[PDB]
Amino acid sequence: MRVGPQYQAVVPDFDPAKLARRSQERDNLGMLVWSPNQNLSEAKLDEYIAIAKEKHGYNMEQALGMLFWHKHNIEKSLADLPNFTPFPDEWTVEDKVLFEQAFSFHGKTFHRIQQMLPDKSIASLVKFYYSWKKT
Amino acid sequence: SMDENYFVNYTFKDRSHSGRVAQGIMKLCLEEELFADVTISVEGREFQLHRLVLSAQSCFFRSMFTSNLKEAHNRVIVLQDVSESVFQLLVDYIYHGTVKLRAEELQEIYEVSDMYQLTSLFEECSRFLARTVQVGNCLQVMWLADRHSDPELYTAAKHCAKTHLAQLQNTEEFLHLPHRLLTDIISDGVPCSQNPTEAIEAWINFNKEEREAFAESLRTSLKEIGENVHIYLIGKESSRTHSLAVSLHCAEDDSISVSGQNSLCHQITAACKHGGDLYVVGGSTTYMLRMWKCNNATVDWEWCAPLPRDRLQHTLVSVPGKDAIYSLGGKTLQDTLSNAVIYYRVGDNVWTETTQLEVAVSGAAGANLNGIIYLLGGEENDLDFFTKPSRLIQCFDTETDKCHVKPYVLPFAGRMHAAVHKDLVFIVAEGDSLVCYNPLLDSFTRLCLPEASLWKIASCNGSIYVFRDRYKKGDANTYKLDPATSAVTVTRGIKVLLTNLQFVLA
Amino acid sequence: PGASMDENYFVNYTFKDRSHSGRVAQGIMKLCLEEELFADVTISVEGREFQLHRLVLSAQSCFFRSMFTSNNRVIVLQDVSESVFQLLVDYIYHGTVKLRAEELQEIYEVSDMYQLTSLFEECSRFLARTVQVGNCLQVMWLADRHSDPELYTAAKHCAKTHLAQLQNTEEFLHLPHRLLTDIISDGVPCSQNPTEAIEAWINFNKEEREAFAESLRTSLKEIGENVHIYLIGKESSRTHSLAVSLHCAEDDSISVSGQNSLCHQITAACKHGGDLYVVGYMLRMWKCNNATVDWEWCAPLPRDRLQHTLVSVPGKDAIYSLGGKTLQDTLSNAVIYYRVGDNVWTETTQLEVAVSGAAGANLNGIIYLLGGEENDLDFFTKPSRLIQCFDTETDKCHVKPYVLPFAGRMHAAVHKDLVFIVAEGDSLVCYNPLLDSFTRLCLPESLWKIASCNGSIYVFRDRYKKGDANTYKLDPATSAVTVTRGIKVLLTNLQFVLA
Amino acid sequence: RRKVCYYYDGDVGNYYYGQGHPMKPHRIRMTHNLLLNYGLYRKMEIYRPHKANAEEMTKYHSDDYIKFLRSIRPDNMSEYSKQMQRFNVGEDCPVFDGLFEFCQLSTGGSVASAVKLNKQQTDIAVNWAGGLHHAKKSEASGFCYVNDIVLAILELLKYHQRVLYIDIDIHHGDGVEEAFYTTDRVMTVSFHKYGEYFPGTGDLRDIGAGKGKYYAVNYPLRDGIDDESYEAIFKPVMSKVMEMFQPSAVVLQCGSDSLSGDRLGCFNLTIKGHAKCVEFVKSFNLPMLMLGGGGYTIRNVARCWTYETAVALDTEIPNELPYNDYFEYFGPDFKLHISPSNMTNQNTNEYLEKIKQRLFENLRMLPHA
Ligand SMILES: O=P(O)(O)O[C@H]1[C@H](OP(=O)(O)O)[C@@H](OP(=O)(O)O)[C@H](OP(=O)(O)O)[C@@H](OP(=O)(O)O)[C@H]1OP(=O)(O)O
Ligand SMILES: [Zn+2]
C-alpha cells in the first residue's frame, strides 16, 4: 500500500449544513423503464406477456417496457402492439455465410471480420457471435 | 539422560571410529601383507589373505571358514569357477572398497558376486547391466537375471525385448526361448508397430510337434498399448505470433517424424509431459493461474484446475510415480524468489501444498528419478537482494516429502536443461558440454559437443536427441549422440520446421 | 563432485561404495567380541587371559602394531589394571567406552602409552573439565609429564587464581621452580597476595632455592582484580534500572561492589572482557565506566531491531548481534558486529532460520544461538527449539539436526566445555556440543537466570517475595544446590545476569 | 417488504476485450436473462445507467489518465507508446474497441446508484456491471480501468458520516483500500486469499497510515476454504465491525470469483454461501449497494448473481432453469445450485482463530464511532 498525494482520494469532510438542500440539485440519473405496481395483478401480466409472445413478436421484456409506456394500462398497450415492431435485424444468407467465412479464415479478431463485413460495426458482430456459438 | 553426569561419569561414543578401522585395514593390510592367515589360490595364484576381513564382508567366506570341515584350520583353499583377474577385483573391493567396473568383464563379476554374497557389488553390477542393455544381448541378460532371482534387471531386460520385438523374431535365441519368458515379454504390452501376432506365430512354427498344443494361452494373453515415443516441441513459429505444439512420433531408429499440431492463443511460462498428455501453464496476462491439457487424439485443450500461486519461471515435474504434476520454485510477481511446492493430482484435478524448499530458485532444471525430484541450478538469491547463477543440487523426495540441498555443486551454473536417461541425468547449459550426473554415486562425467547458441535434451525411448534452438538453417539443428561412444550423428525429417524452441519435453 | 573425463558410465567407470567402512566396522564389532572367532594373539593383564586379534589392535594404535611386528607367546602387560584394559578393549573393538571419574587419571596414563589419540584427547577434556583447588598442582604435574599444553593451561589457571589457598599446603611445598614460574609469571590477581607466597615458597628450603629468589620476584605479573556477574536490574518504583556488579570471593560468598543507577532504558546488553556494553532510543550503545562511575558513548547500530542477541567475542575482539524483531512483528536474521577499537559496525552472513529473543553463548569461537521463538503458521510466532552454530571465523551458520528438550525464552551459561541452559522451571540442561548430547539436572522449587563466576554455577531467581535470599550456588558435580549470601542490595526484578 | 432497484444497460455484454482473455462482460447479459425468466423483474425497479461523462470520472482519477483512456484505440496503438507503457494499459488491461464506453457505463451505473441511494428513495441498489476494485488513481490494474467503487463512495460521503465496504472476492481490493487508506470515514473490510497471489498486497499488518489507522480490515485466507468455515469467520467479524464502527451505509462488492470452479479461482465455496453472506449483510437495515467484479466461469457467475438478486428481494427460486436463451451454456443438468469439489482447505481452524483474535484486537481500539 502506497501513501502520498497522488495515491489516495480527497474525501470531503463532513458538515451537516449540506444534508438537506442538495436533495434536488442533482436529479434522477437514468431512465425508469419499469416499476412494480400494486394495482395490476400479475395474472393479467402473465396473460399479457403470453399474448405478447404468442400473438405478437414481442418477448419477455419489451412487453414490460411497452406496458410501462402507457402507465400500466393493458388495453392501450395491446392497441399499440401492431404499431412498433421487434426490429428483425435479419442476418441474411450473405451476412451469416460471410461471417462463417471470416470466422473460419480468421478467428476472434472481429476487426478482421470487419474487413469483409464493412457495413456492420462491431457490437452487432459480438452480439451475433455469443448468440451464434450454439452450433 | 539422567545418570550420565559430565563431571562424574558418562558414555563417550567415538563417531570417527568406523573410518579409523577401515583406513587401518586398507593401509596396514593390503600393503605390508602383515598378519595374514589364509591362502586363497585361484587358477594358479596364491593370495595371502586374512580371515577377519573376508568374513566381515561376505557370509560365504564366513560359512567356509568357521566350518566343521577338514580345510578349516589347514591352510590352502582352491576356489573353482572364477578367474585370477576377477578375484583380484574382489580383493580390491573387499579390502579397499573401490573397484574399477568395466563392461568387458562384467557379467562374470556379477555372477561371481552373487556366489560370494557381496550384496553391494551385486546390486551395482545389476544396475550397470541395466544401463548397457542392448537389443542383441537382451534375451541373454533376461535369461541371466532369472537364474539369479533378480526382478529389477529382469524388468529392465524385459522392457527392451518388449519394445524391440520386431527385429527380434528371426534371431535364433527368440526361437529357443521357453514358455515363461515369452509369456512375460508378451503379457506386458507389445506395440502394434512391433507386430507381435506374427511374432508369436513365428515362435510356434518351430517345434510345432510339441508346441501347438502348448502355445494358445499366449495368444489369449497378448496385449497392445498406445504410443509413448514422443518429444512434444513447443516453439513460436517465424510466421504468426502463436506458438505451435508439435508432436514428434519417433520411428524405430535414426529417424524422428511429426504427428500433428495444435497451436495456442496464450503464452506459456512452463510445460510438462505426463504419460503422453501435454500440460501447459501460464497466460499472456498477469493472472498466470491458468493451465491446459492437450493430446494428439483430441486437437483440443481440456482446461484443468488453476494453480493456487502466481509464479513464472517455475518448474513442472511429472513422471506417474503416483499421478501428480509438481511445481517447484519460481519467481513471483514482484521479482522475489519463491520456494513453495504445490502438486496436482491428475486423477482429481486438485492442487495441494506440501513442504517448501530450502533455497528459493527460479528456472531450475528438474529431473524425476523413480520418485525423487532433482532441482538443478537455475537462478539463486544473491546477497544485495539480486540474483546470481546457481550451482546447487536439490533432492525433493515425493514419498516422505523432505527436500535437502546436496553438499556438492555442478561444474557450470545458470540456465540449463536436463533429461533423465536409464538411470542418469544428462545436463546441458553453457554452450557445448553435457554432463551425465549419477545421483547414486554422486559424480559427474563430461562428454563435449560440436562447437557450433543453446541446446535442449530429450531422451526419446532409446537414444538422446539434442535439439539446438536457433534454427539457422545452415546447421543440421538436430543431433543424436550415442552415450557409450559419444558418436554425435545427424537425424533428419523435422518436416514442419520451427525457428525458436522454448520447450523440448520428454 | 569432480567432472571426470576418463570414465564412462556406459563403458567404464569406478565404483565407490559408501557403506564400506561401516560394514567392516560392525563386522569386526560383531563376529569378534561376541562369538570370539579367529582369535590370534593372547594378551595377559595381571592374571586374566585376553584372546585378542592382531589386525584390530594394529589398526587402532601404533604401540601394538610396533609390538606384534618385532622380527609367539602370551604377551603380558605389567603396568595396567584388569579393569582398565577392559575399557581399552571395549574401546578398540566397539568404540564406545564408559568413562568414570575414579578410573580416569589411570586411563590418561595408559591411553597415552598405547597411543590411542582420541581417547587421550577426550580423556584430557574430561580431566581438565573437573579440576578443583584440591588437585590443580597435581594435574599440572600430570599435564607436564605427558606434554599436554591444553590441559596444562586449564590446570594452571585454577592454580594461579586460587593461589593464596595453596601457599601453605604441601603440593605447593615440593614444587619445582619451572612450574612456579609458569604460575606466577602469567597474571596472578592481587587478591591472593602473590608477593608473600613467593617468599613463603622460599622458606620451604630457604638456603637453596634463594639464588633466583630476588630474580623470581622480578618475574611475576601482578594484575588488578576484574569484576564478575553484572545485574542490570529494575529496582524500586521506576528510577530506571541499575548496573550492580558482584566482586567474587573464594569463600562461597558473592559481594557487591558499587552500583551505577545512571540508566535510561535497556533492550539488550552484554559484558565484554571486563566492561559493560549496553544497547537501548533503540539503536544506541553506552559503556559502563565504573572506575569513574560515568557511562560513555559509542557508535549506533546500522539498523533497528528488538530483542536481538548480543554475544561478546573476546577472540576477535568484537561483539555479534543476532536475530530479533524489526519494529513490525516480522522476525529478522541479520548478524552484525562491532570491533572494539575500530569502533565500526559491519555485517556478516545471515542466519538459516530467523529467530528472536534467543540465548546466545560462545564456545572459544563458535557462537551457539539457543532457543528463542520462530515464526509459524502463518503470520505469528511460536517458541522454537532450534540449535544454531555461527562459526565466527569461516562465517558459516547452519542448524543442528536436533532440538532441545524444551522451548521458549531461556538463559544459558558457558562453563568449561559445556553450555548450561535453563528455562521455564524444574529443568537445567547441560549441553555438550562436541559429542552432541544433553544431560538434565534437578533443581529446587518462575523463570530464573544462570551465571558462571569461576568454578561454580550461580543461579539467580529473578523474582522475590521480599526476604528469602533466592541466590543459589550450584555445584554440578554432585548437583549440590546451596544458598549463598553476603549480597547487601534490595534488587527486586532484575532483567538479566551478565556473567 | 423492501424496495429494490436494478441498473442494467442492454449494451454492456457487447464489449469484447480480446482473444483468450479471462474477463468476458457477456456474463452480465446472461445474469440479466435469468432475472428475466425467474420472475425477478416484475418486482424490481429496472433503470438504465447514464453514460458517465469524463468530468465526474476526474473527481478521483488524474486528468492525463482519463484523457489517455478517452484518446486511445487499437488502430493507433503505435502513436501512444510511452503513454500506454506508463498507465499499465496494454498487456494486462488490453485496449479494445469500446473501452471508454464500457467505463462510462459501469461508472455511470454505480455513481447514479449511489446518488439515488443516499436520497432515501430505494433501500437496496443492485449493479452487477460495476465493482472494478483493482483500478488505481493514475493507472489500470487487474482487468480494471476505472475504479467505480471509489467514485460511488466519494458520492456516498456527501450525506453519510461513515461508510463500510465489504470485499468477498478472492482477490484483495487494493484500489479501494488504497484510495481510502488515510481517511477514517470509510472502513474497508476485505476477506481474501494471501499467499503468493494477485495483487500481492493485503497483509495482516498493513492497517492505516495517518488519521485512518485501525480503519482497514484485511482477513487473509488460504486455498480451498469451504462454506461452513467462511460463514463461521464471516459472521463474528462483521458483527464486531458493525458494533465497533457503527456505519451508515454499506457497499458490498459481491464478487462471484471465489466459488467452486473458476478459470482463475482457488476457494471452494458454493452459491448458497455467498447467499448467506449477502443475507447477513442485508439483515442490518442499512442503505446497501451491491456491486459485481470478479468471476471468470460465466455460467457459475450468472447463477451466483441471479441467486444474489433472489436474496436481495425475498422471493425463493427453484433449482430448475426456466426457458431463457442460453441453455447451450449451462451444463447437462439445468440446475441453479452448484456443488463443491474435492479441494481441501489448508487453513486449519486455529489459523482462523488466531487471525480472528488479531482482528478483534485491532477492532477494540477504534474510538466510539
Ligand atoms: O472450456 P474451454 O475448452 O477452455 O473453452 C473456452 C470456452 O469455450 P466453449 O464455448 O467451447 O465452452 C469459452 O466460452 P464461455 O465459457 O465464455 O462460454 C471461450 O470464450 P468465448 O468464446 O466466450 O470468448 C474460450 O475462448 P477464449 O480462450 O478465446 O477466450 C474457450 O477457450 P479455448 O480457446 O481454450 O477453447
Ligand atoms: Zn477477483
Residue numbers in the entry:
A (entry chain D): 1 to 135
B (entry chain B): 26 to 477, 483 to 536
C (entry chain A): 23 to 93, 99 to 307, 312 to 476, 483 to 536
D (entry chain C): 8 to 376
Authors' own words:
As a substrate receptor of the CULLIN3-RING E3 ubiquitin ligase complex, KBTBD4 is recurrently mutated in medulloblastoma, the most common embryonal brain tumour in children. The interface between HDAC1 and one of the KBTBD4 β-propellers is stabilized by the medulloblastoma mutations, which insert a bulky side chain into the HDAC1 active site pocket.
To elucidate the mechanism by which double insertions enable high-affinity engagement of the LHC complex, we determined the cryo-electron microscopy (cryo-EM) structures of two LHC-bound KBTBD4 MB mutants, KBTBD4-PR and KBTBD4-TTYML. We chose KBTBD4-TTYML in addition to KBTBD4-PR mutant because it lacks a basic residue in the 2b-2c loop. The KBTBD4 dimer is well resolved in both structures, which were determined at 3.42 and 3.30 Å resolution for the PR and TTYML mutants, respectively. In KBTBD4-TTYML, the mutant 2b-2c loop in β-propeller-A is solvent-exposed and structurally disordered. By contrast, the same loop in β-propeller-B adopts an ordered conformation, making close interactions with HDAC1. The 2b-2c loops of the two KBTBD4 mutants are positioned at the periphery of the HDAC1 active site pocket and, despite their sequence diversity, both insert the bulky side chain of a central residue into the deacetylase catalytic site tunnel. In an analogous manner, the aromatic side chain of Tyr312 in KBTBD4-TTYML also protrudes into the HDAC1 tunnel, whereas Leu314 partially fulfils the same role as Arg314 in KBTBD4-PR. By contrast, mutation of both Tyr312 and Met313 in KBTBD4-TTYML (that is, KBTBD4-TTAAL) was necessary to block CoREST degradation, suggesting that Met313 also has a critical role in the hotspot interaction or might functionally replace Tyr312 in the Tyr312Ala context. Although tyrosine is not as strongly favoured as arginine, the two leading threonine residues, Thr310 and Thr311, of the TTYML mutant might compensate by making closer contacts with an HDAC1 surface loop—donating an H-bond from Thr311 to HDAC1 Asp99.
